[PDB]
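Schema walkthrough. Field components (list of strings):
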Amino acid sequence: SRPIKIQQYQWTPGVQLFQTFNPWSDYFGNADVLEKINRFRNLRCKLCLKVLINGNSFYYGRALLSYNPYLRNDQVTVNRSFFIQDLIAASNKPHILLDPCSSEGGQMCLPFIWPENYLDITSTGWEDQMGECIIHDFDVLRHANGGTDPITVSIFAWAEDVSLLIPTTVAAQ
Amino acid sequence: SRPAVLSDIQPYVPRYCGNLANSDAPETVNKLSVDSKNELIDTRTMGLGGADELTIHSIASRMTFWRQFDWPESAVTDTLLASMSVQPFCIDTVTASPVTEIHSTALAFASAPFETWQGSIKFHFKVVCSEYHRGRLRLVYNPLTNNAGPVAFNQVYSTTIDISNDREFDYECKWTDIRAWNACIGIDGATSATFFNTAAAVTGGTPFDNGTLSVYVVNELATPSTAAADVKVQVWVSAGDDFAVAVPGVGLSQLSYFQQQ
Amino acid sequence: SRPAVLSDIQPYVPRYCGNLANSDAPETVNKLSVDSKNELIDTRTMGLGGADELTIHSIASRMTFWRQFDWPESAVTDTLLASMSVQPFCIDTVTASPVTEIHSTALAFASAPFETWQGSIKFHFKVVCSEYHRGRLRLVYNPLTNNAGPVAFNQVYSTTIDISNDREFDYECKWTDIRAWNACIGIDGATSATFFNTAAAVTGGTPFDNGTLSVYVVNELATPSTAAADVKVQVWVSAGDDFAVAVPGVGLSQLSYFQQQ
Amino acid sequence: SRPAVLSDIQPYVPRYCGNLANSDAPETVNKLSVDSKNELIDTRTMGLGGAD
Amino acid sequence: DNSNNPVGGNPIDNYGTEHAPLLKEDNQYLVYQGERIVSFKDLLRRYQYLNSYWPQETGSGFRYYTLDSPGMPIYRGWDPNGIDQGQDSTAGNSPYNFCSMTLLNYLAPAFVCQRGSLRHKWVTAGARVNSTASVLSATRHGVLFPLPLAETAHPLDNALVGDRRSELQEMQRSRLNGTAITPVRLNNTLEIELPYYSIGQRFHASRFLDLAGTGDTQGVEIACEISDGGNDANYRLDQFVSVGEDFTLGMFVGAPIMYFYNDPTAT
Amino acid sequence: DNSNNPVGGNPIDNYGTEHAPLLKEDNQYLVYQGERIVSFKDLLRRYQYLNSYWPQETGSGFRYYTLDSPGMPIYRGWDPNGIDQGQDSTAGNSPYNFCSMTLLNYLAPAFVCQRGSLRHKWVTAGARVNSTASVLSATRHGVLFPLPLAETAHPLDNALVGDRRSELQEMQRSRLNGTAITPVRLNNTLEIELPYYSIGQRFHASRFLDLAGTGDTQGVEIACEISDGGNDANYRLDQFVSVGEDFTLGMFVGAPIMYFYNDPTAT
Amino acid sequence: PSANDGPSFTTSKTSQNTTSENVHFVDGDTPWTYDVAATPDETSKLSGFDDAGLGEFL
Amino acid sequence: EFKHDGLISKPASAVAKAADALSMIPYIAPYAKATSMVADKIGKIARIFGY
Amino acid sequence: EFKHDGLISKPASAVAKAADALSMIPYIAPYAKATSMVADKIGKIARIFGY
Amino acid sequence: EFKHDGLISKPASAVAKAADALSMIPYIAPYAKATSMVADKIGKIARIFGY
Amino acid sequence: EFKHDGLISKPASAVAKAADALSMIPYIAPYAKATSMVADKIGKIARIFGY
Amino acid sequence: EFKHDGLISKPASAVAKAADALSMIPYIAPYAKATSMVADKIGKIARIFGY
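Field assembly_structure (string):
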C-alpha cells in the first residue's frame, strides 16, 4: 500500500502528450516490492493510481487518461499512433480529464478484473496483460503569455486490498 | 392394457423449427448437461458491481466524446463555429485508402440494430481555455436549418451562455418533431452524410433527425496578451431521459469488425 | 361422435430419440414386463449392510495404498526421500513389453470420467521400522516446485514429524491454487507423466495439480546396532473432505480391461 | 431420465392448415414481432371519435 | 494407539487454519459449473452410444435380421471372444470389440454384486431403400440359458406362404415374452427396458467380462426386416445403453487392472 | 465546481418547460409500435441465421460428416483466418467469412467479460435423396482444448464391419459428453444449448474475434450422414444462433472500430 | 452520486489530504475520482491461510 | 420460473399501463439467477428487461 | 414417484442453496425402492444423489 | 383474453337468447385493446361484434 | 354440452341400471337445441336417446 | 374405471407391502362388470387379480 511514482512526463507548450503505460507492470516491476512479493505465489490486489498536475492559470488545453481493463485475448481497442478519433472509444473506458488551468483531479481505482482468482506471481509476464493506461491529448499544450516552460504530470500507484498468502520456494518474477 | 382411453381427440399442429421470432415464448431445448436446471447466475461474481448493463438506456446514456472544433481570434459576432444534427448516429470516420475506420459513440452503438428512434439527445460542450479568455457562445436549435448569414434572436430557440462561470455545460435537445418516431439512418448510412459541418450549417428537417443544433459567437474572445490563442470546444453526446428505440431491423447486417482488405 | 371438439389447437414438437443427455427427465420407455411399475429394491438383500456406494465421495474417500519408498542409512539432513504431486490421478504401471498394466487408486478410479476437479487430497504415510529407529521426517508443501538443494524452513509450508510417537500419520493437502477448478489428466494421461520421483522433486505448478508434497530428512536415522537397516515408508492416498469433480468428459474412452495383445 | 412416464396414450389429429372457415377459434400463429402479446388499440388515436 | 489401522488415520497439523473450506462456499456452482455431480447413480442415467449393427451382412434376399445381444453392454478391448478382428502387436490378427467404453462398463468390474433393470435405445440410422415398411422389434429371452451375442437371418421371400410363416415362428417375437414393436418409417426408436428376472438369484457377478461369448440373463433379441438391394448396405442399428431405476452395485473391492491403447486397424 | 467531470453534466436552461415529456405518455405504444424494447437481453433471445454448411464437400462414398464449430458465432468480415475466400481490393484473394452479423457478434466486443449458455438450432434444408434415414447429432467437446472450426468425414461403407465401427468410435457422439440426436426424416431440428463449463474460469474474453481459427470452450460437433450420389449436393445445414438464460456481459468499454462494406465476389 | 453517471460507475471529488502508508499528499484542490464500482463476492479468496503472512515474516 | 404455461400470465410485450417503469434500474440480488428470481422479486413488470 | 410433471418441482441439477448437504450420506430403509421412497423420506434435496 | 380453451366458454355463434342485443352499440374505452378488453367490459355477449 | 372429456362422465352405451327408462318419451322444450339442453334437462340417462 | 391417468394411482405390478393378500379370493357381485366395479369394491389391491 506504499505509493511509488510509476510515471513522470512533461508537457511543453506546442507539443502534445501521447503516452502509454501499464500500471500493473510498473508497480509490480519495482525492485523494492519484488523483494516483498518474493516467496509467495498468490496476489489478488486492486491497484489504485493518482495523477498530479501542477499547471498555472495561463496554460490551457486538456488531456484524457483512459484505462483498458483486461486485454488478454483482445484483438480490438487499438494501441497505435495518435488519431483524434481514438478519443471517442477511449472516453467510454474509465477515464480522467487533466488540464493545467484549474490544475486538478485524477484518481482511479482500477479493479482486479481477471477470470481466475489469485493470479500467480511465479509465471512469466504475470502482470502485463491486466489493463493499461493511455494518455491522449486533445490538441496541444498552450500558454497565453507566450511562456514556454514545461509542466509535469506525475502518476503514482499503490495496491489497496492485498491478499498475499501461499508461500513457495520459487523466485517471484 | 386393461381399460380403453375415452379422452377426446385433441387437435395439434407440429412446430419442428420452433418459435424463432418472439423473445418470450418458452422453448423445447435439449440442454447438453447432466442437470436439466443447469444455470449460472448473472451478478458481481465476475469482479464487478452487479448492475445490469444490457439495458439500452444504460448503454446509450453514457457521455462519450464525439468531435471537436475551434473558436478563432478572427471570429466576430454572429459567426458560426459548428453545426450538428440532433440524432443518435454520431460517428466519425478515418479513411486510409483501402480501409475506412468508423468510430462510433455509445449512443450510436446502442441504436444501430433498430429502425425507429425518438426522444431527447444530450450534448455536452467543453471549452478549453485559460481563465482570461472571455466571451459568449450561443446555441441555436432550429428544426429545419439555419440561414446562410446571421440568425436572429427571435424566430429560433437559443441560450447565450457566458463562459466565465460555465466553461463546461450540457444542453438537452427535446423532441419537437411532427411525428412521434423518426427513422434510423444506421451506422452504415451515417458514414456518407454530413452531420457536423463547422463551415456552414448542416441540413436538418429530414425524417431521420430532430433538427439541428448550432454554435454562434455573441461576444468576441478577449485575450490577455498579444499571443495567438487557439481555443477549442469539445462536443460530447449522450441520450436524454426520453430516448427510446424500436423496430429491430437490418441496420447492422453490413457492418464488420475486420478491415476492408 | 355426438359433439364437436372445440379445444384449442395445441402446438407440439416430436421427440423420437428422446432426451439422452440429461439425467433427471422422465422417459417414455416400454418396459418389457407384465407390471408397468415393475421395480426391485436397492438395499441389504444382497447380503450387505445397506449403504449407497455409488456416491463419488464414498468411492474416492477410501484410503488405498499407492507407492512405497525407502529411507537409507546414508540419508543426512536435507535429503529428499520422495516427492509427489497433489492430484487425484495416483496410478502405477507395470510394463512387460507387449502389455502395460495400470493399477489405479480408488481416488484415481472415481475421478477418471470427469474433466475438472477441486478439493483436498489426503496422504497417509506409514513408516515400517523397529522401536529403535529414530529420526525426524519433514513434509514440504510447495505450490510450484522445490529447488535442487536444501529447502529452507521459511518460504514453504512444513510440519517436521517425529517418528517416535507417530510412525503412521496422514496429511491433508488443502486447496491453495489460483483457480477454483483444476483440470483432470485422466488415467490415460497420467501414465506418461512423472508424479512420484524419489530421486528429484516432481514438477508441479501445472493447471492439472495442486502443487507438490515432498519428504525430507531433518534428523538422521538412529540405529541399535551395526546391522544394515532398510527402513521403508508407504504412501497411501485418499480424497479429503473438500473433494469434488465436475464436467463429465472423454477421460475413459480409451481405457480397457483387456490386455494389449 | 430417472422415472418412466406412465400417463395414458392420448389420441390426436394433426391440423396443418388450421381452421380457416370459423371466425372465433384461436390460432397457432407465429407473429413476427419481439413481444408475443404485441397489439395496438382500436380507438380515437386516429383523430376520430372512437365508434366501432 | 491407531498404529495398524487398515484405513489409516492420524491427523497431524497441516497448513490450514480453516478445515475443509470449500464446503462453506454455498454459491460456488452459481459461478463456475452450473450443476453439481455427487453420485454415479445420477450420472449412469445418461445414455451413451455403444455399438452399431449392419443387417445386410448375414443373409440374402428379403429376410428378417435378428440379433441376440446381452442386456449389459459388451466390453471395449482385445477380447479372446470378440465380435470383430483387429491387427495386434505381432502384425497378426486377434479378436477385438470396436465398441465404446461406457460408464457402466467402467464401474461394474470394481464391484462384487450387480442387480437391476437396464435401458436400451435402438436408433436405426443410415440409408435405406424407398420400398420399406419394416417393423423394428425388441423381445426378451429366458433367464435360464444366457445366449451369446449372435446374428441370424430368417428368409421371408419363399414361394410358399407356410414356409414364410414357419420362419416367423422361429423368432422370439412370436412368443409370450415381453415384446415392443415400432415402424421404422414412423418412429424408428424402441426405448426398451430389460427387467431383472432371475431363477432365485439375488445378484450376479459384476466382474464378468465375457458378455459377447456367454451373454447374461437379461438378453434381448432385436429384429428388423432387410432386403438385398443396394442402398440398404448403409442401413444400420445404433445401440444406446443406460441404467434402469432399480439398479444397484454391490461392495467396492477396488479398481481393476486397466489398459490404455487406441483402436487398431480392423482386419 | 463540476468542471472536469469525466461524465460531464451541468444543465443549462434549454427550450422546454416540461422536462422529459415522452415518459409521461403512458399509452404511447398502444398507438404506434405495439411493444416496447427496453433491454438487449430480451432482444438477444431471438434466433438469427448465421451460416450454412454443405456435407457433400469433404469426403467420398457414403460417410459421416462431422463439423467442429464454436459455441459462439464466428464474425462476419475479412478474417486473416476465414473459412472462405473472397476477392479483395487489390484484385487478389483473402480469407473471408460469408456469415451474418448477429446481435451477439455486435454486442460482444464492446464488453470486457462474457459468461453464459448459448443456444443453437440446426435446420437441415435443401434437397436430399430418397434413400436416407440419417440421424443429425450434436455433442459437446471438452473445456480444456478449444478446437477450431473444422470439417471431417468418417467413411462408413467399408467391406469390414469392424472398420466401420472403428470410424464410429473416432466420433464425439460415442463419448460420455452430452449428446442430442434426431432423425432427419422425422424432425430434422436439434435445438441444443451449450452450458458454460470451465476450468475454474469466471468469464472469458468477450473481445476475442478469432473464433474460426481458435474456437472457444463451448464448442460442439455436429454430425450427419451423407452419400456421394447426386441431389445430395444441395443438402445443407443451417445454423441459427441465440443466447441462453444464464448469459451476461461484463463492463462496457466502448464500441469497437467498425467497418462498412458489402460481401465481395467469392473466389 | 449525481451528474450523469450510471449504476456501473461513480464520479466523485475526494479530499485534498490523501494518506496511504507513509506518503502524504496535500493537494491544492479536490481531485476527481472514477470508481468502476467493483465489489467482488465471497468464494473469491482463499480462507484459512492467514498463518504465514508478510507482516509476521520474522 | 419453470412453470406450466407461463406466457399466458405475462403482460409479455407491451404497454401494460403500469409497465411504464422503463426508467427503473433492475436490481440483481448477490447470487440471483435469471429464472426463479428478480422477475418475481422486483415486480410484475420485470419481464420487459428480459427476465 | 410416478407423478405428472415431476421435473418442474425439482431443484434438479444444481446449487439450490440449501442443497449443500452433499456431505450427508443417504440412508436406505430396509426394503426401500428408488421411486416412491427416500427422495421423499430423506429430504427435498435427495435428488442430487440420483433418487 | 389469452386464456386456455376460450372457445368452450363462449356462446360463440348464435342465438344465446340474451344475445339479442344486436341493436346495442359497442363502447370502446379510450385506449382499449381488442383482447383483454370490451369483450369482458361490455358484457357476456360482446363476442358477436368480433371482440 | 361442449365440455372437456365428456365421454368419461357418461354411462354412454348400456345398462347403467337406472337407465332402464327406455319406456319414457323425451320432452323437447319449445326452442331446445341438442347440445346444451335436454341431455341435462330431462335426466342423467337422456344420452341413450342420442342427446 | 374410465378415468384420466389411472396407471399413476395404481400400485400396478408388485409387492406394495399390503398387497400380500394374494391368498384372498375375489368376490364378484351378482351383475358386476370389470371396469367400474370390484377393483373399487373389494379393496385397493384388487388390481393384481386383473381388475
